[PDB]
């Protein structure tokens, strides 16, 4: 079936074939391995006679060092458990450090008290050599030296199997001095012969060698009855290997094998012990049981600790949360109950985005780049025609790949067929009239954001945010879900059908999809959407890589969980390689990813002197999270206009000052008053047939 080798107690060894002896090594020794062709080597390390680690080498290309005190190092580099690499699996099975090599045909283990263990598959029958001896049932021949000769001295054999290194050259080990016996302690060793539970194993394993070993370790003892425990434990494990598990040996004897805090020692622990965050796949566990530690009945493992079945947490994003905790995912919430999350399953507002050299995000989060040069239907309510958004794209640099949106056009049929045009430079026109902002006109509202970006709103259900350089963000409430059409998709929570076309079929190619939504027939139909513009300008490739790599740096690791950085990285490299100015587009792409993170509620302090600082006008101060509601003096003039907007980064006046039309920060005593659309200076007074008014403190 499979062999077993053990190094147990203070200085004892047990071979694959049952030969058992003592060796107090002072170096590292070969326990087992391929004996002619050594594909792998299992190496036991000693120090001052005591065991310190169990190393494995796969043939000079991989080495792993499992120490007694839980530490694992691959080479000299420390690693943490569990660990898996190149066919080797390190696991804390049954509370004992395992090192499995199924592919290589071996399993190693260190128990809580430092006893080594090696199980070697049948394929190495009569083909292994080392301190564990060869593996052929004849036990008398286990002491073969590396020179190929038998020896009656265990130390000759063991020292023959020493292995030196570049920082440890092996000294000749020799038996230590000793004194040798006490009757009361000797009774404990006689337990192996007298007790009924151990007597079960006599037909399979002769207890006499273990009794002799127990007697001599009692002579070596420096304590109480526990000194006999290693022999009893090894005898029980040998019996378990042969087939008889001695379920009751721990109760009859005074011994108690060491286990980590809170776990009980038990025979025949199933290797598939139940951690909470584990799938209930019991059919897979066809393996035999092993001795080891287990959590008390009714408790479950959780990161190595034992917890109650109801106490134990959920896992998300690599973090553990106690039961009852709630996590938000935009407008949805997820509640941890049992090990599962109960999530809110509701539609959240859809955000379509155009953010650079024709990079797009559909309402269903389908990222794509199209680079067509025409007027394209970005988003429309094809069901009720509540609105219709069109973008005008132009080549934005010398490169054929640099195409970005120049202007945006919005039809609002319900507002007497108003035609707003958001222009380059963040200007606005309405029905061809250039208009002065803020504009309040029925449901339509247009105003400058703190970023100088024009923000348009129409009712509650439609909003837009236009920076004037080419970035457009369209936010629809759930009222438009499924009703939408255009490049932004149908807004139905599915990426799969976002390449739908007015023909009713989904184009597999972005080029055909985008060409289907072009408004003017004389426009060029895009033939191929060339990725990687860096080929046309090789000079920029190094900068593109080394600069846009920051999106994956620890600067943004706080956001990688919330938003996937890969699409934004692709867009960043494309932009930097294709733009007229690589610095400006680098800042644009980084700001796009940071804006996505902020949308997911994660704020990253990504701007620095070496990249993309906002040089605020005059005395205004840059804030990463500032409130827009009470910045302008119009807020003073209209205090009852409700404002609940979240904070945003931008340039704000210091806390005690408001901002006027000139952008100058002024105390509220110096703000003008806006009345009936007319601007009155501080302390102005006027009286009419109907009214008497005066301006004070911006009101």
């Amino acid at each position: 079936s499979t062999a077993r080798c053990s190094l147990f107690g203070s200085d004892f060894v047990n071979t694959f074939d049952g030969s058992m002896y003592s060796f107090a090594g002072y170096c590292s020794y070969l326990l087992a391995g391929g004996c002619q062709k050594r594909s792998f080597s299992i190496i036991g390390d000693f120090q001052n006679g005591k065991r310190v680690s169990l190393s494995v080498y796969l043939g000079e290309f991989f080495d792993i060092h499992l120490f007694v005190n839980g530490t694992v190092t691959q080479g000299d580099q420390r690693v943490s458990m569990p660990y898996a690499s190149k066919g080797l699996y390190l696991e804390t099975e049954a509370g004992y450090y395992k090192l499995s090599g199924e592919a290589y045909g071996f399993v190693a283990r260190i128990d809580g008290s430092g006893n080594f263990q090696v199980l070697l598959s049948d394929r190495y029958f009569n083909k292994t050599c080392g301190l564990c001896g060869n593996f052929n049932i004849f036990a008398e021949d286990d002491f073969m030296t590396q020179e190929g000769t038998l020896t009656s001295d265990p130390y000759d054999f063991a020292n023959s199997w020493a292995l030196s290194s570049g920082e440890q050259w092996c000294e000749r080990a020799s038996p230590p001095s000793s004194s040798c016996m006490q009757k009361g302690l000797w009774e404990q060793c006689q337990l192996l012969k007298s007790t009924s539970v151990f007597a079960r194993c006599h037909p399979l394993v002769d207890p006499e060698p273990f009794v002799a070993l127990c007697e001599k370790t009692l002579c070596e003892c420096a304590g109480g009855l526990e000194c006999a425990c290693p022999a009893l434990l090894e005898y029980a494990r040998t019996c378990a290997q042969e087939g008889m598990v001695l379920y009751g040996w721990t109760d009859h004897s005074a011994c108690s094998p060491v286990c980590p805090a809170g776990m009980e020692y038990r025979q025949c622990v199933s290797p598939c012990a139940r951690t909470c965050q584990s799938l209930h796949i019991n059919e897979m566990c066809q393996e035999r049981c092993v001795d080891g530690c287990s959590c008390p009945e009714g408790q479950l493992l959780d990161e190595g600790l034992c917890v109650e079945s109801t106490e134990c947490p959920c896992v998300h994003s690599g973090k553990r949360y106690p039961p009852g905790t709630s996590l938000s995912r935009d407008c949805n919430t997820c509640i941890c109950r049992n090990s599962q999350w109960i999530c809110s399953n509701e539609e959240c507002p859809g955000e379509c985005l155009v953010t650079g050299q024709s990079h797009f995000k559909s309402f269903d989060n389908r990222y794509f780049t199209f680079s067509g040069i025409c007027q394209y239907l970005l988003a429309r309510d094809c069901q009720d025609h509540s609105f219709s958004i069109v973008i005008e794209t132009v080549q934005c640099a010398d490169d054929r790949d640099a195409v970005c949106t120049r202007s945006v056009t919005v039809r609002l049929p319900g507002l007497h067929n108003s035609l707003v045009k958001l222009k380059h430079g963040a200007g606005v026109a309405m029905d061809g009239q250039d208009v002065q902002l803020p504009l309040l006109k029925g449901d339509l509202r247009i105003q400058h954001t703190v970023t100088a970006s024009v923000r348009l709103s129409y009712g509650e259900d439609l909003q837009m945010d236009w920076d004037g350089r080419g970035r457009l963000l369209v936010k629809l409430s759930p009222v438009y879900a499924g009703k939408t059409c255009g490049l932004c998709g149908n807004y139905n929570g599915n990426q799969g059908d976002d390449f739908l076309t007015p023909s009713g079929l989904a184009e597999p190619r972005v080029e055909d999809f985008g060409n289907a939504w072009k408004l003017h027939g004389d426009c060029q139909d895009l033939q191929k959407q060339h990725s990687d513009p860096c080929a046309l300008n090789p000079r920029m490739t190094r900068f593109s890589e080394e600069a846009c790599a920051v999106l994956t740096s620890p600067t943004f690791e706080a956001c990688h969980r919330a938003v996937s950085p890969l699409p934004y990285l692709r867009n960043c490299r494309y932009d930097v390689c294709s733009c007229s100015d690589g610095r400006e587009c680098l800042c644009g792409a980084l700001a796009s990813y940071a804006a996505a993170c902020a949308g997911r509620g994660v704020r990253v302090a990504w701007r620095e002197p070496g990249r993309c600082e906002l040089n605020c006008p005059k005395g205004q101060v840059y804030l990463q999270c500032g409130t827009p509601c009470n910045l302008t003096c119009r807020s003073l003039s209209y205090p009852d206009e409700e404002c609940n907007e979240a904070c945003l980064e931008g340039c704000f006046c210091p806390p005690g000052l408001y901002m006027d039309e000139r952008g100058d920060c002024v105390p509220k005593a110096q703000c003008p008053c806006y009345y009936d659309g007319e601007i009155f200076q501080p302390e102005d007074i006027f009286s009419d047939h109907h009214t008497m008014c005066y301006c004070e403190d911006g009101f």
């Binding site: 994003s317 709630s326 919430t333 109950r337 429309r380 023909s503 184009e507 597999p508 003017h520 890589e545």
Partner: protein, 615 residues
């Protein structure tokens, strides 16, 4: 600006779109081919080419016909193919390609999840690599109907038999092993890495695992085993590992190229230019039907990670996967060459007779030919598969044991009486269930039983009564929608298996907002009565109650009745009275505890059916 260069008309393409806001055929006539062409005679467009009305196009298993510039398509749910592409990339049923390198064993597909009584479970283990490597291989464990089939070392190992071995079958063809595990489940395996699971529509919405929940939606495919959707595929895969003790994938930083190409230039570009074979002429016609970019990414990743030596299998297998997809879409591609990923079948032709040349490589051959071991024809998922194919004369049949053609004779072998009260009338009903901690799980169970028996006492159908169930726990978790076509027994089962949230807050105004704007978004049954049970057991913070009156008044304007059923001392009586003030029919029920629902049920259903008209 140093410039140094140089109502609306309609076209068949842009007829439905807006007019270009940057500046003539008769009405009912449209520009086409630079001539005016009548409407209803404009062609339809697909893949950039036009189709005249009445023409047809083949899309998977569905057929589309061009009528009035609109494609009119059949609505069949075609068989879906999950696929492991390469050594660390997966492609879900809904088409989501994602990266997940792992050493452990993971659930590839499984229906033993959720409430569904499971029937099959497929596990995939990665052996020899997690970072793609030359000596790698994958082990598949197919735990179907208690039986177990293990795929390893390019050979099938039936480690336990199935209950119905007639449903079971194994077909070896070309490079692939084809397993039939039932009428609706099949597995195709290239014997090295590319595992593919094919499901028919009967398994829709039921399966889970690394292949995702087959529902036609991509966004939800990263649903962890604990039902939480993950932004990172690494966490999703770690959540789907079978053995808890095994190691987790570490989320290595997302370098633009893998290790051994991150700092090895002239290997990155060799890999790139060699993987561009996907763009070459032979594949150029397939690229119109299938996007090569995902497979190009897989090719680059696996080729950097592998840096293979003797067998070029990583690259060749990725290209073969793309060619397999192309063949599924009818674009058979002859990409093999003597100098690029060559394959030979001559080992089967050299024989003790000397040489006889029945075996050829074929770009793809029919997958499930007749043989002495499979005399009857048997349906199987893939029509055409690459690999060695035995060609031999008419009437002659292959023997798989001989790997030789031999003669055919040479083979070696609804429900009204559920209660006295039954409510057959036009009604739309929503149950809003308080998911706050003010109900313990036991109380939530009796509340669910109250919902379930009321559904027993309603004539559930699109005709008569439509029922929806919505738990609110600061977010409106809908379990049943009024559009659901499932049978009344299935709906009652779903209601009975509503889970318990136990949130510390359950915004009542938020669920009123949800029902107002998302449930009753469009009144598709204006003749039917529309009613909601706002059964509630908790307070909400005052800041969250500010729009409550607005939402209830909006519901009134849509004539949606709201019947608050307050329960227990912690019920927000104020919100209940505010609802009552809006309309007389919004009369409130106030209960001492959830067990009083058993007493109030009869008159509650009586009132609900009093508030509904007959046909």
């Amino acid at each position: 600006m140093h410039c140094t260069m140089s109502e609306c008309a309609k076209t068949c393409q842009n007829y439905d779109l807006e007019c270009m806001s940057m500046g003539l055929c008769p009405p009912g006539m449209v520009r086409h081919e630079n001539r005016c062409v009548a409407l209803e005679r404009c062609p339809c467009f697909h893949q950039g080419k036009e189709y005249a009305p009445g023409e047809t196009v083949k899309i998977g298993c569905n057929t589309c016909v061009c009528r009035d510039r609109k494609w009119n398509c059949t609505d069949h749910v075609c068989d879906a193919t999950c696929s492991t592409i390469g050594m660390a990339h997966y492609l879900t049923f809904d088409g989501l390609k994602y990266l997940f390198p792992g050493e452990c064993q993971y659930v590839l597909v499984q229906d033993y999840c959720g409430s569904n009584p499971g029937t099959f479970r497929i596990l995939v283990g990665n052996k020899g690599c997690s970072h793609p490597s030359v000596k790698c291989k994958k082990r598949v464990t197919i735990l179907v109907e208690g039986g177990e089939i293990e795929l390893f070392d390019g050979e099938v190992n039936v480690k336990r038999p199935m209950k119905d071995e007639t449903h079971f079958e194994v077909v070896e063809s070309g490079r692939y092993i084809i397993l039939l595990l039932g009428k609706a489940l099949s597995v195709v395996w290239d014997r090295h890495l590319s595992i593919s699971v094919v499901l028919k529509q009967t398994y829709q919405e039921k399966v889970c695992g690394l292949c995702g929940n087959f529902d036609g939606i991509q966004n939800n495919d990263l649903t962890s085993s604990n039902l939480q959707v993950e932004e990172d595929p690494v966490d999703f895969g770690n959540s789907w590992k079978v053995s808890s003790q095994c190691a987790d994938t570490r989320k290595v930083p997302l370098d633009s190229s893998p290790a051994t190409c991150h700092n090895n230039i002239m290997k990155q570009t060799m890999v790139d230019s060699s993987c561009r074979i996907l763009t070459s002429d032979v594949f150029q016609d397939c690229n119109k039907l299938v996007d090569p970019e995902p497979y190009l990414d897989v090719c680059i990743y696996d080729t950097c990670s592998c840096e293979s030596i003797g067998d070029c299998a990583c690259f060749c297998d990725t290209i073969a996967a793309y060619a397999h997809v192309c063949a599924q879409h009818g674009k058979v591609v002859t990409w093999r060459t003597a100098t690029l990923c060559p394959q030979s079948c001559e080992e089967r032709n050299l024989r003790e007779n000397g040489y006889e040349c029945e075996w050829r490589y074929n770009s793809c051959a029919p997958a499930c030919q007749v043989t002495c071991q499979h005399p009857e024809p048997l349906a199987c998922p893939v029509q055409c598969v690459e690999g060695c194919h035995a060609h031999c004369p008419p009437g002659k049949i292959l023997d798989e044991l001989l790997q030789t053609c031999v003669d055919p004779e040479d083979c070696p072998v609804s429900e009204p009486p559920l209660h006295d009260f039954y409510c057959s009338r036009l009604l739309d009903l929503v149950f809003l269930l308080d998911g706050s901690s003010r109900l313990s799980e036991a109380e939530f169970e009796v509340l669910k039983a109250f919902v379930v028996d009321m559904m027993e006492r309603l004539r559930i159908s699109q005709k008569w009564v439509r029922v929806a169930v919505v738990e609110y726990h600061d977010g409106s978790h809908a379990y049943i929608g009024l559009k659901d076509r499932k049978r009344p027994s299935e709906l009652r089962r779903i209601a009975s298996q509503v889970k318990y949230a136990g949130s510390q807050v359950a915004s009542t105004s938020e669920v009123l907002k949800y029902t107002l704007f998302q449930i009753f978004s469009k009144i598709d049954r204006p003749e039917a009565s529309r009613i909601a049970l706002l059964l509630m057991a908790s307070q909400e913070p005052q800041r969250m109650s500010r729009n409550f009156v607005r939402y209830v008044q909006g519901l009134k304007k849509k004539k949606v009745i709201v019947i608050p059923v307050g329960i227990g001392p912690h019920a927000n009586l104020k919100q209940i009275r505010l609802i009552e003030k809006q309309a007389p029919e919004n009369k409130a029920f106030v209960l001492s505890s959830v067990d009083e629902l058993e007493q109030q049920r009869d008159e509650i259903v009586s009132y609900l059916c009093d508030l509904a008209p007959e046909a």
